[PDB]
Design a protein around this nucleic acid. Structure first.
Lengths: 123, 83, 22, 80, 199
RNA sequence: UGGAGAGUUCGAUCCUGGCUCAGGAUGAACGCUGGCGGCAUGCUUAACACAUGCAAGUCGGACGGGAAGUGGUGUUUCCAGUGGCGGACGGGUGAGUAACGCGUAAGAACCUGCCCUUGGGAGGGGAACAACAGCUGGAAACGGCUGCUAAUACCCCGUAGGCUGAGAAGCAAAAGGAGGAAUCCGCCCGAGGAGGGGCUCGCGUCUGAUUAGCUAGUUGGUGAGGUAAUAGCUUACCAAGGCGAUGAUCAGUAGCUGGUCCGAGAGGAUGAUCAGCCACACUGGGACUGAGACACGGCCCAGACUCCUACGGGAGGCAGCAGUGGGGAAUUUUCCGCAAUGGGCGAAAGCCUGACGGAGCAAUGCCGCGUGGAGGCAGAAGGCCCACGGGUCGUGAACUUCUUUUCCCGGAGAAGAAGCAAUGACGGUAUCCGGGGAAUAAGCAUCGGCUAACUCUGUGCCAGCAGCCGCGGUAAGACAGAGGAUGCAAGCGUUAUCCGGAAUGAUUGGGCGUAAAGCGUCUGUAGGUGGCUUUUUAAGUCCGCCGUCAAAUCCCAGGGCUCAACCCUGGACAG
């Protein structure tokens, strides 16, 4: 342990803290309009065609976001809503998309996870 | 009223003496003694107390905004550095 | 609906009385 | 000035009603400098500390409507 | 949901031990197997399956049980035993051990439909803690029902637990004192359940 | 009565070590779903800009009157006006402020409406003035002349403890009004009490020193000036100091605390709701009135906006309640009432009072209940698996007897009202009795390992999954669907955020030969520590006691709403 007399001179205290995903002033979700909807390749162990879109937030920042599930309907003028979660396979992508909200539609014919992916109840 | 003891460091001021009070007090979070030293501007209208004298300070009527304490007694003589 | 006669809550009344005490 | 009455602590249907020693320029349910006693409406619980009363009333305290009646319901305030 | 609805004797099976969710059903578990040697259960499995055995027996939820184990931990005395004190004092459990109801899930409906009186007054709440010297009886209007008459017709022969004393003719049962360790006849280890909540 | 971890850096092992997950919590949002009740809570993002209504008025037992309404034949009562008191109470916001703002402990140089204890006095006069009336300038706002008039409007005179003064002496106050064979209230001065509000001092009060210098009334001293009061608060002069590494100044950020969340504790992160304190209220500045606010709903000036105009000139500002626009992931009825508690006024009645008491919207959270109970086959259809010899979903269902809270319908009906022609918003209230009938009421996540729970198909590094290690290139329990199972529950799941796990800043709890780590080596100031004996001091320390540590949280024991949440007595604790 650092000696008791050096603990009065220096006094150990943490930092200003860095955030994992800057979604402003402690806000859970953030709204924004999609600028460019493109397709990008993953890292070294994976090889697929993942759909990523650059979302222009309400603050003025343009960060990338991942689209979950099979099939979507996001255009160049679509008003989407982000979540805030890393994928760790695609570099730069720190956000996720909440489907079933605003302009983002839910996944068709999905029977499993209806709370996430934004799917309604089939009768 | 409260009484605090200390040594005079500066005497080059008209009817005012700068008294440095040393106070030893243990830390509530830790255990060891942490020494704090704050200087008080005492009143001396008779200009008897010079530099190096250890006097006790009592609370009284504020003669200015910084001064509120007066020097009433004297416990010992000159305990300073040699010229 | 509005009243048949004229009325206005004078805020200058409390100011005139304050000027008289001054 | 200072007066005697009762405040509110118990909300909704259950109005318990507090103790008293508060100023008129303060709140309905705020700061109280000294404690005394209270009463519960739908119960047989009636306190009202007698050595605290008469000791506070001698120095400019006004006895208002609510502190009264509950004062004469007990053995205090009579021709004794 | 307040009390589990649906498959009752699915939990009497699988777990090994046989509780009283109904009357009496077979020892064997579900599926084609389970009648042979089961797989090696982990250290965390013995803490999870033992608390689910105590939760299902009384027909209590996880939200209500969480309060009865925390207040018992903050209170003075042996923690492991005072979990079974506040859980046995429930009006739906003391009704099963009285002989007025065949099981615990059917005893909650008996208290809710206003059939039981406590000290003269009528209580609807099953999660009500029954303090000693209380008279748990039936109502004068609900004395003529065929379900209450059939359950108390089998009771004058069977011996009731030592902390209770039932009188067969006036249909009333008194609770004298608190239930202790050797007075409990359940197949549950109370030291494995208190170790789960403090992970 | 309080302290469980595991996965992953290797061929592997043991360390070191970062990352990740299991927990709880959050005035939360989103997605799916959605039966109620009790209690609490609800722009945390623009202190942004605001339609409308309301949020402070009350007294004629202070007056000149009487424009309404009700009697009588002039009294209740009362529109305006003079005057008294309150608009500096309450409500809201936290922008600003790390600062003598706040918290804790002391101090002296104070003021202080209404209330209260004590003593004395309350005599005798004067000149006006709104309202009103006759004219009159203007679109309006706002007014401009002349005349009449009352009072607890005002101003003298007389008297005077107090004040000034060493003393002698000098000098300043007034209101009267009501019921009654003289009571009640109020008025003026002084000396106290109480309560409130200023002022002084010390400690603790964020981060960055790749901000180390800062400071002229700046520090202090004489004299006048000034404040309720000490005082550089102020002016002139004299001295020239004053602050700083126990870190000033500067920059960024921020209301403080009681407490709240987590945690075994310590500690860490915060301080929404409730309560104390401070500050602000269109922005900046200033003064007046008054005991007190240099004052949200007061005034004046300037500025940016909105609105009116006969453009000459004027009127406003919700960080009060409810609402609009806008922003935002997101946060509600432009409701009812004075009945209850409280505030303002009044000798009362009574009036005013979106303070508040209630209701409404919202599963936002906590708590309780309910959506069925027993009985029922040799395990029926119909699905999933199948070695097709079966098994499972399944007592699950159907089929049978039974009870029916809550929801619905009908009849009763406690208490919160003390006051006291018997006075309630809430209320078709709580709760109770009866009548139909299970009749109206469940889902969500997950199932490779940590994580509690399985296979068969389809797809097939394709499409997709994912907190981490990682899964998918034909039979992958980690994709997609189904059967089944697990967990939880009207909640569930996801995300955000703090704490825990991190003895990974360790004060309680860690380390520096090689894993990150002794500065290359000495001298040495401040600072930290310091042999032995006796006496003394006793400051630290320790014991006891007296204050304060607000209340409410938390904890212990005990009560009341059918339980609980919640509410509540005393104690404990406030280190």
């Amino acid at each position: 342990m650092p000696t008791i007399k050096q603990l009065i001179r220096n006094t150990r205290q943490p930092i200003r803290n860095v955030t994992k995903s800057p979604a402003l002033r402690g806000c859970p979700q953030r709204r924004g309009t999609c600028t460019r909807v493109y397709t990008i390749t993953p890292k070294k162990p994976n090889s697929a065609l993942r759909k990523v879109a650059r979302v222009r937030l309400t603050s003025g920042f343009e960060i990338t976001a991942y689209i979950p599930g099979i099939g979507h309907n996001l255009q160049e003028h679509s008003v989407v809503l982000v979540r805030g979660g890393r994928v760790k396979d695609l570099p730069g992508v720190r956000y996720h998309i909440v489907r079933g909200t605003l302009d983002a539609v839910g996944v068709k014919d999905r029977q499993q996870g209806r709370s996430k992916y934004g799917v309604k109840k089939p009768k | 009223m409260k009484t605090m003891q200390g040594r005079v460091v500066c005497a080059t001021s008209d009817k005012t003496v700068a008294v440095e009070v040393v106070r030893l007090a243990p830390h509530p979070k830790y255990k060891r003694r942490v020494r704090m030293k704050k200087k008080y501007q005492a009143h001396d209208p008779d200009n008897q107390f010079k530099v190096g004298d250890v006097v006790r300070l009592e609370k009284s009527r504020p003669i200015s905004k910084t001064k509120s304490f007066v020097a009433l007694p004297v416990i010992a003589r000159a305990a300073r550095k040699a010229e | 609906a509005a009243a048949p006669t004229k009325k206005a809550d004078s805020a200058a009344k409390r100011a005139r009385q304050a000027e008289k005490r001054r | 000035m200072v007066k005697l009455r009762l405040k509110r602590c118990g909300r909704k249907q259950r109005a318990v009603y507090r103790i008293v020693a508060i100023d008129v320029r303060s709140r309905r349910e705020g700061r109280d400098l000294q404690k005394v006693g209270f009463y519960d409406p739908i119960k047989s619980q009636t306190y009202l500390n007698v050595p605290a009363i008469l000791d506070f009333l001698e120095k400019g305290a006004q006895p208002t409507e609510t502190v009264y009646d509950i004062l004469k319901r007990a053995e205090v305030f009579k021709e004794f | 949901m307040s009390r589990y609805r649906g498959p009752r004797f699915k939990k009497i099976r699988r777990l090994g031990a046989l509780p009283g969710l109904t009357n009496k059903r077979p020892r064997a578990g579900s599926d084609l197997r389970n009648q042979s040697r089961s797989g090696k259960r982990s250290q965390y499995r013995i803490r999870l399956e033992e608390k689910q055995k105590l939760r299902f027996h009384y027909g209590i939820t996880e939200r209500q049980l969480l309060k009865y184990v925390r207040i018992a931990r903050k209170a003075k005395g042996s923690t492991g035993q005072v979990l079974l004190q506040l859980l046995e004092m429930r009006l739906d459990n003391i009704l099963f051990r009285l002989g007025m109801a065949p099981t615990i899930p059917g005893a909650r409906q008996l208290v809710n439909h206003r059939h039981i009186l406590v000290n003269g007054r009528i209580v609807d709440i099953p999660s009500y803690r029954c303090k000693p010297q209380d008279t748990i009886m039936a109502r004068d209007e609900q004395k003529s029902i065929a379900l209450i008459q059939n359950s108390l017709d089998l009771s004058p022969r069977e011996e009731l637990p030592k902390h209770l004393t039932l009188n067969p003719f006036p249909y009333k049962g008194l609770v004298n004192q608190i239930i202790d360790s050797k007075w409990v006849g359940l197949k549950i280890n109370e030291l494995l359940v208190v170790e789960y909540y403090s992970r």
